[PDB]
Design a protein around this ligand. Structure first.
Ligand SMILES: Cc1c(C(=O)C2=C(O)CCCC2=O)ccc2c1c(=O)n(Cc1cccc3ccccc13)c(=O)n2C
Ligand SMILES: Cc1c(C(=O)C2=C(O)CCCC2=O)ccc2c1c(=O)n(Cc1cccc3ccccc13)c(=O)n2C
Ligand SMILES: [Co+2]
Ligand SMILES: [Co+2]
Lengths: 381, 381
């Protein structure tokens, strides 16, 4: 069931912005670890005396890394005279965010038809305003409302290159890395209480609950009209023998925030071979692979979708596989991206649901919780 | 002239500690950019609820990257019950340092015979105490005094693996990168006033001025008895046409601090080939190469030390060459290591002064200031 109840016209995920203490070092690590190219910058070299912001791209995926400079560099400026390319930026907010949460996502940005309208209708429908709509060089409009914790949902709309005041990056400094990652599939938040978080976000967006099919959590997924903007939300389940990883997140993050980003690959096998080659030379680590009983159970569940060869390749790379009633999901999880056991990345590929591929084809891996437990015990043999 | 006036027995540089907002991402970038192996860690996985610290090594060079966790993880602890492996660490100090300075060096650590004695004699001779001597697991003694700005000189002494409470890193996670870097040659500070900085540091160490042989700066080098611990210090020269890079440092750093680390390579050509291969894929960038007139002037100054082939190789890699009365210096400078135009790295190799090689053989590149200007104008032809 899809009521198509969006209160304003939503297009696609546009970008994700990390707030950092040093944007250079995070951006360079991510670039090499994920195979993303340096494509735009806004910093001292472009006249920005407020913040350093570096943009990585792979396909349609856009990762933005931003850190504050000394406030003294811009102490003479006022908002009407600011050199910041992102007018919502605030030194105090950024430093407070990073000292409270460590490295993580500040903004989940979606492109909309009209960012000013999205902002007003959102706020009219319960959204807590974060930064009012501002028109940049008469070309791009940017507005922000609170999403959860200190994460904002950022509306971006274009009259008609990333943002004004960003410069394309020199081709010498811009090496065309590509491991097959192509777009953001979903972005997932952890909160202490799922009900009120859902009521709030669905309340100001009109996003609807995405239909799906006892370990750790409860969740629900909010979706836009064409279900291409997908925002799952988790809450912890307390009292378990094994302490909820959602609760560990909340403790180490100092409250709610973004838990994982799921990046669609056009060839998850190429992506994982490439990322795994680089894990111990500056890239990203992956969670421990499932036991071979898990892959010794894959024939009976997806034997009609993947060959024996493609299954063995899943076993080599530690890939997980789930299926719903319309499609199949290949997925794998990184270890946390920084010091704290908080944010991590998921790589996914979806097969099925062809009409273009419909959003969320195969679900989000709900079945792999039960399957992982079962195969763990079967390998215990 | 070397009075050998050290007020306590100094051995060698031991390590350099960067204070970070996220230590994981800086450490992984540095590891790949410099070819340094992950060798020890102290973090949540080792029981440290206070700070995350990761150690990179290449030869005898030791780079330590440390960031604070949420204070809430250790709110129940007191100093007698701390889980920090570095007892001088303070959340408030670390966050204040990084927000004021951005990414940079907090500690220049030297190994001494007796860290408690070095501390007392230092403080008795004008050193401002930063952290008193503390004995770790009855095996290692650690003490800190102020050096300049918010940088400390850290004394480390061993009765008899890095520090207690650090764990050796798994060989899976520890890839044996090596681009030829072998030890720290010198560590250089920028201050507003050279005279008082020298009087202070030479005052509490007994370090002597290292003898050498109008662009930007004045400097002097402090040295230990065998001149293997080398601490140059710069001050800006004001009123120039070209604004002093020392003054730019002080403005963007919010005052005094460490300007560059000079890393000796056993094969600067291999090191620079390897680092330059990686500049645009997550490593380090290098300052703009000198004009070919500079290399077209190298025959007349070092033609007795480097072949024509070894000179052309200098031209390919952008290496600079200087000479004093006892030896020859090959050197090159990276662009800044992080967002701000503050700290950078120098790669060097020294040839001559064999007895072992004596410290500072060839100097620090004083002559390359005049030579660079001259060759710039000659290429202007
Ligand atoms: C993150 C995720 C998803 C996922 O994407 C996701 C959505 O998009 C929206 C719905 C809620 C949700 O969850 C699906 C399955 C997952 C994981 C995962 O993170 N984990 C890893 C793991 C969790 C705890 C403890 C662990 C201990 C060791 C190793 C892994 C651990 C899984 O096992 N499954 C099976
Ligand atoms: C950092 C250094 C040293 C050096 O090691 C050092 C010591 O150890 C102790 C003594 C003081 C000192 O200085 C020696 C020579 C150097 C540089 C250097 O940094 N630079 C780079 C540069 C400086 C300004 C403006 C620049 C603009 C563009 C490119 C480079 C620029 C040089 O040119 N020389 C020639
Ligand atoms: Co997911
Ligand atoms: Co130097």
């Amino acid at each position: 069931k899809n009521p198509k109840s969006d209160k304003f016209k939503v297009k696609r995920f546009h970008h994700i912005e990390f707030w950092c203490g040093d944007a250079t070092n995070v951006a360079r690590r991510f670039s090499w670890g994920l195979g993303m190219r340096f494509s735009a910058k806004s910093d001292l070299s472009t006249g920005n005396m407020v913040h350093a912001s570096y943009l990585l791209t792979s396909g349609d995926l856009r990762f933005l890394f931003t850190a504050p400079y000394s406030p003294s560099l811009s102490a003479g400026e006022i908002k009407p005279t600011t050199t910041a390319s992102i007018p919502s930026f605030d030194h105090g907010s950024c430093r407070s965010f990073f000292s409270s949460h460590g490295l993580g996502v500040r903004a989940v940005a979606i492109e909309v038809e009209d960012a000013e309208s999205a902002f007003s209708i959102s706020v009219a429908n319960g959204a807590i305003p974060s930064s009012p709509p501002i028109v940049l060089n008469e070309a791009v409009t940017i507005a922000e409302v609170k999403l959860y914790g200190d994460v904002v949902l950022r509306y971006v709309s274009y009259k008609a290159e990333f943002l004004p005041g960003f410069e394309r990056v020199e081709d010498a400094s811009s090496f065309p890395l590509d491991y097959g990652i192509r777009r953001l599939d979903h972005a997932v938040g952890n909160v202490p209480e799922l009900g009120p978080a859902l009521t709030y976000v669905a309340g100001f967006t009109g996003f609807h609950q995405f239909a799906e099919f006892e370990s750790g959590l409860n969740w629900a997924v909010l979706a836009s009209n064409d279900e291409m903007v997908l925002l799952p939300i988790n809450e912890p389940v307390h009292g378990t023998k094994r302490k909820s990883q959602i609760q560990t997140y909340l403790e180490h993050n100092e409250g709610a925030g973004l838990q994982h980003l799921a990046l669609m690959s056009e060839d998850i096998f190429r992506t994982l071979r490439e990322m795994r080659k680089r894990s111990s030379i500056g890239g990203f680590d992956f969670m421990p692979s499932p036991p071979p009983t898990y892959y010794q159970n894959l024939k009976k569940r997806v034997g009609d979708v993947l060959s024996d060869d493609q299954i063995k390749e899943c076993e080599e790379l530690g890939i997980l596989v789930d299926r719903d009633d319309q499609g199949t999901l290949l997925q794998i999880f990184t270890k946390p991206l920084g010091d704290r056991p908080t944010i991590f990345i998921e790589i996914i590929q979806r097969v099925g649901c062809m009409m273009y591929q419909s959003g969320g084809c195969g679900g989000f891996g709900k079945g792999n919780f039960s399957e992982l437990f079962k195969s763990i015990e079967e390998y215990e043999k």
